[PDB]
Design a protein around this ligand. Sequence first.
Ligand SMILES: O=C(O)COc1c2cc(S(=O)(=O)O)cc1Cc1cc(S(=O)(=O)O)cc(c1OCC(=O)O)Cc1cc(S(=O)(=O)O)cc(c1OCC(=O)O)Cc1cc(S(=O)(=O)O)cc(c1OCC(=O)O)C2
Ligand SMILES: O=C(O)COc1c2cc(S(=O)(=O)O)cc1Cc1cc(S(=O)(=O)O)cc(c1OCC(=O)O)Cc1cc(S(=O)(=O)O)cc(c1OCC(=O)O)Cc1cc(S(=O)(=O)O)cc(c1OCC(=O)O)C2
Ligand code: HEC
Ligand code: HEC
Ligand code: NA
Lengths: 107, 107
Amino acid sequence: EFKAGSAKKGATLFKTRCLQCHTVEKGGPHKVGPNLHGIFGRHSGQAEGYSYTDANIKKNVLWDENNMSEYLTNPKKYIPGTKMAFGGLKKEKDRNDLITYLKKATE
Amino acid sequence: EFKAGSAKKGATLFKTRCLQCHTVEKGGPHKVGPNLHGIFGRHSGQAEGYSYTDANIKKNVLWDENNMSEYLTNPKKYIPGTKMAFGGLKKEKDRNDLITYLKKATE
Ligand SMILES: O=C(O)COc1c2cc(S(=O)(=O)O)cc1Cc1cc(S(=O)(=O)O)cc(c1OCC(=O)O)Cc1cc(S(=O)(=O)O)cc(c1OCC(=O)O)Cc1cc(S(=O)(=O)O)cc(c1OCC(=O)O)C2
Ligand SMILES: O=C(O)COc1c2cc(S(=O)(=O)O)cc1Cc1cc(S(=O)(=O)O)cc(c1OCC(=O)O)Cc1cc(S(=O)(=O)O)cc(c1OCC(=O)O)Cc1cc(S(=O)(=O)O)cc(c1OCC(=O)O)C2
Ligand code: HEC
Ligand code: HEC
Ligand code: NA
């Protein structure tokens, strides 16, 4: 259950928990993970130029703040077979802050 | 203006005229030019993870078989300021064959 949080705290969390694998800006490069520009409102496995697992593509989830909060809690449970090596953001406050930043940064 | 041609001949033309800068398959990499999967029915300058010119983004053309054929005839004339260093496919039969292949390969 998503609730708007602190984009400032979320930016700091993104720099330590996500930035190593993902960029957010339009035209930002794909790295270990896909560039996340426009992720909200895009179906999973649809960023062109990125080699996804069939698991991520087949899940075909339409990304929204609410299902992304469920996904980021435990990625392997959400998408069994995903190659995103991320254990999960277990604190609701952290997910709210990170997703608030992500929505602003990927717009 | 587009008329269905030979996808077999189009595949060979893609190899000699496009492949040096582009891939077509789902998950294929961005190179000098963006990966072209899902190009038809998408607006120009929208493949994630690729850094386009402002010219290509501003053009905001919804790609279809006809405007693709005009574009490929003379890219710099259709999108002034584009960084696609391609003189153009001047032959109608070559554009028809290539687009017939692209319609299949990018979908
Ligand atoms: O227990 C649990 O079920 C939950 O564990 C946590 C997770 C997320 C958060 S949280 O978002 O609220 O913060 C907090 C904890 C609890 C915890 C807190 C801290 S600490 O107090 O903050 O120092 C340090 C460690 C922690 O785990 C204690 C333990 O394991 O007993 C020990 C550690 C440190 C580091 S490391 O420093 O980043 O390299 C990495 C891992 C760690 O786990 C080692 C282990 O597995 O063996 C692996 C791991 C990575 C990630 S990431 O990929 O999403 O980053 C998320 C989780 C991870 O655990 C996977 C797993 O549990 O299966 C899930
Ligand atoms: O056969 C027909 O009845 C009529 O075919 C044409 C001719 C002249 C003109 S035209 O002057 O108005 O242009 C236009 C066409 C129709 C056509 C147009 C275009 S296109 O839309 O304009 O691109 C492309 C091709 C064309 O032929 C479609 C097809 O073959 O089914 C495919 C092609 C491309 C090229 S290429 O320019 O070197 O790349 C070369 C040839 C091609 O044809 C063979 C193939 O591909 O195997 C060989 C050929 C050369 C010459 S030249 O040396 O005397 O000029 C004249 C003709 C030729 O074809 C002879 C042959 O068939 O027997 C006759
Ligand atoms: C590298 C070790 C990563 C870290 C750290 C995080 N992500 Fe990731 N992510 C990574 C990969 C390799 C993939 C593709 C997975 C696949 O199975 O193909 C992803 C994917 C995502 C997605 C889905 C993107 C899509 O287009 O469907 C999202 C929404 C995502 N990652 C978000 C994300 C965030 C917010 C992270 C920090 C909290 C994060 N990822 C860390 C690799 C890595
Ligand atoms: C390198 C020398 C290229 C060759 C050869 C071809 N293309 Fe290209 N293409 C290239 C670049 C650098 C760009 C981006 C242009 C920009 O101004 O940002 C492109 C772009 C395209 C596009 C538009 C893609 C979009 O998402 O809007 C298309 C449809 C395209 N290119 C098609 C294409 C084909 C079919 C070619 C062979 C005939 C071809 N390109 C060659 C670089 C290069
Ligand atoms: Na742990």
